């Protein structure tokens, strides 16, 4: 299937409590593999998956130097954004940044990303052509004009289309058993009474990887999108994921409903009924 | 646009002393760089900084140190540990550490084992040959600056009280008078060519001026001869029919 | 990383075109820049190139880029004395520092309209008994060599008398030895056959 590598950076100012806290993490697909925390004692990029510990000291030295430079840049940005929005020094604020790349089934480049938010809201993003920028508001326009005049995109496009893809390919090969795997969900269904004339049917999917999954309910073969409660897919903590979907049915009509499960690890979708 | 500056243009120190070279830029650049160049060789990267509060070693960092407390400044310290401090030192900057860099004017740093090796230049002007005037109707004056160390000199020609550039050629670099020996004293030559009629006017005044950069007040001097401090040494000649 | 420039140095006559090469890594290319570095000045950026096959031009200067094989050529048409300089090439990758080559040093020899080669003796203005010899007005085919003695000889230098549209080469020899005379000062150089040696 397709794959992706994504890096996520968060910097939070803390008025009256010192320099901002910076946390960085990297993912291949739904598997985390590195982190950096400006508040931790190590002051190093650290492994968070067994397969990345195969990299030697030069890799860890180099990733530490680079992420420390990221840390200081986003520290400056917090001060810059405070000025752009004419904010006081009293409030805590957050800068977020994500970048990375997608590849298809041939592991060839498919798409690149590089985008920012300030206080949970879109700030500036590199467009899909990897040549122009989307500026959320008037303050992001200042950044856009600066990055255009400086040719930032032409340099980023070399990373997103080239270097990023090379690293992803390398990681997929070196973490084959973990990353090029598919775990089909284990499924079952539960039944609870809501009132004396109504019941909840909850359809479960467990122990599946990757996180992408679809659960839908049907009544007499007809989708029930409006009356279906979904929960956010959640990690079990061992590398697999969990999810459920529920529907309230009139008691005694449980036989009219079917749950349908689609996952990359299933040869065909599953249909589940209440027994 | 702003600019990037370095100071001072010439530095001279006794071996074993630490010295810090200044580099400042109001170009709004985040990335700054330090290079050294030896005569005949290329640039060699000493240290760089991509952002305030971050610096990383180059290929020849041993004996050097930097700080980057402020975006606008990137000072380089040459510690006693540096084995061959004497070199030309260039600072540079760029918006974000990709694409073209912008270089400051550079600092020439010389260190010596002994301070008694410092000598100011002697300057002499040699007047045009009468054979030249008759053969070509032009007249070449030659200035010689000789016996100075370090090779930190700036030479200029002054005609009737105003510095001149037309008809002037100065050697690109001083020549060592005892090449095998180091440290050794240097010499430098320059020529000014004018019309014969212009040289034959006794109202015209020609002057060769050598600015020499040497010792300061802090340096201690117990030697017999005059203290070889920074000074201007000059020689002059007048036109003659 | 390794950036290789060639040749190390080269000499061309004013008006002739020239070109030199920069060889750089064939993988993970992010940008190439060219600089001009004149004597008594600092490097000044001429071109930045990122697109394979693109051609850049400024004045009489131009550059091409081939990222597949890792080559860039710099061309100067109708070269002028002002073009004399060291030209540097630099290579960017996924990093915050560029890799600089060691440079190509170009010397453009000026055209000399009417050569009149000669060796003149000049007298000091103040202190007596001092003198130098001035070899002057030779064309650019002449090369000046150092002496085989403790005699001092400077390299060829070009001065420009702007208002008269006139340029001339010269070299200076001096010494305080008893044998040193202008007749013999430049003996270690191959001098023009018709070089003028003024009588007494």
């Amino acid at each position: 299937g397709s794959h992706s590598m994504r890096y996520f950076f968060t910097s939070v100012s803390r008025p009256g409590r010192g320099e901002p806290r910076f946390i960085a993490v990297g993912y291949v697909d739904d598997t985390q593999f590195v982190r950096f925390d400006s508040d931790a004692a190590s002051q190093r990029m650290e492994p968070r998956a067994p397969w990345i510990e195969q990299e030697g000291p030069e890799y860890w030295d180099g990733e530490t130097r680079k992420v420390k430079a990221h840390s200081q840049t986003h520290r400056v940005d917090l001060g810059t954004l405070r000025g752009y929005y004419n904010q006081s020094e009293a409030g805590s604020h957050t800068v977020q940044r994500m970048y990375g790349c997608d590849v298809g089934s041939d592991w060839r480049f498919l798409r690149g990303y590089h985008q920012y938010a300030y206080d949970g809201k879109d700030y500036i993003a590199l467009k899909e052509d990897l040549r122009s920028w989307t500026a959320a508001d008037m303050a992001a326009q200042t950044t856009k004009h600066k990055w255009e005049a400086a040719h930032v995109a032409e340099q980023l496009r070399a990373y997103l289309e080239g270097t990023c893809v090379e690293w992803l390919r390398r990681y997929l090969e070196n973490g084959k058993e973990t990353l090029q795997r598919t775990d089909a969900p284990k499924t079952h269904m539960t039944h609870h009474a809501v009132s004396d004339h109504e019941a909840t049917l909850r359809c479960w999917a467990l122990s599946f990887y990757p996180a992408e999954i679809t659960l839908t309910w049907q009544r007499d073969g007809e989708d029930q999108t409006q009356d279906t409660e979904l929960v956010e897919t959640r990690p079990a903590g061992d590398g697999t994921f969990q999810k459920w979907a529920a529907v309230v049915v009139p008691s005694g009509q449980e036989q009219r409903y079917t749950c349908h499960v689609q996952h990359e690890g299933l040869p065909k979708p599953l249909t589940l009924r209440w027994e | 646009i702003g600019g990037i500056t370095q100071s001072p243009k010439y530095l001279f120190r006794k071996e074993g002393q630490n010295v810090t070279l200044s580099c400042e830029q109001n170009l709004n650049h985040d990335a700054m760089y330090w290079y050294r160049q030896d005569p005949g060789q290329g640039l060699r990267l000493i240290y760089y900084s991509q952002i305030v509060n971050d610096f990383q070693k180059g290929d020849i960092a041993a004996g050097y140190s930097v700080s980057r407390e402020k975006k606008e400044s990137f000072p380089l310290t040459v510690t006693s540990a540096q084995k061959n401090p004497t070199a030309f030192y260039l600072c540079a900057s760029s918006i974000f550490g990709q694409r073209e860099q912008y270089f400051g004017p550079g600092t020439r740093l010389t260190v010596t084992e002994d301070l008694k090796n410092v000598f100011p230049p002697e300057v002499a002007v040699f007047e045009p040959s009468e054979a030249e005037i008759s053969h070509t109707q032009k007249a070449t004056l030659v200035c010689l600056a000789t016996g100075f160390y370090p090779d930190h000199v700036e030479l200029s020609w002054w005609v009737n009280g105003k510095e001149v550039h037309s008809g002037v050629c100065t050697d690109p670099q001083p020549l060592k008078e005892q090449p095998a020996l180091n440290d050794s004293r240097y010499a430098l030559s320059s020529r000014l060519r004018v019309s014969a009629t212009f040289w034959q006017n006794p109202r015209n005044h020609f002057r060769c001026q050598v600015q020499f950069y040497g010792l300061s007040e802090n340096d201690e001097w117990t030697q017999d001869r005059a203290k070889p401090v920074t000074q201007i040494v000059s020689a002059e000649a007048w036109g003659r029919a | 990383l390794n950036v290789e420039q060639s040749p190390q140095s080269l000499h061309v006559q004013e008006g002739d075109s020239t070109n030199f090469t920069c060889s750089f890594p064939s993988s993970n290319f992010y940008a190439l820049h060219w600089y001009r570095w004149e004597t008594a000045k600092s490097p000044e950026a001429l071109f930045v190139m990122t697109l394979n096959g693109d051609e850049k031009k400024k004045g009489r200067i131009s550059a091409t880029l081939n990222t597949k094989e890792g080559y860039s050529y710099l061309y100067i048409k109708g070269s002028q004395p002002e073009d004399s300089a060291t030209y540097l090439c630099a290579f960017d990758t996924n990093a915050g520092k560029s890799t600089f080559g060691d440079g190509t040093t170009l010397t453009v020899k000026p055209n000399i309209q009417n050569p009149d080669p000669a060796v003149y003796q000049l007298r000091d203005s103040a202190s007596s008994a001092k003198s130098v010899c001035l070899f002057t007005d030779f064309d650019s085919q002449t090369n000046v060599s150092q002496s085989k003695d403790d005699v001092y000889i400077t390299d060829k230098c070009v001065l420009d008398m702007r208002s008269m549209d006139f340029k001339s080469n010269s070299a200076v020899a001096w010494s305080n030895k008893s044998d040193f005379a202008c007749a013999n000062a430049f003996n270690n150089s191959i001098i023009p056959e018709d070089t003028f040696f003024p009588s007494p």
């Binding site: 680079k66 990221h70 940005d77 954004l81 950044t143 | 991509q50 952002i51 974000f96 | 915050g96």
Partner: peptide, 9 residues
């Protein structure tokens, strides 16, 4: 591997 260069907003 992450970006090797950085730029301010």
């Amino acid at each position: 591997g992450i970006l090797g260069f950085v730029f301010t907003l």
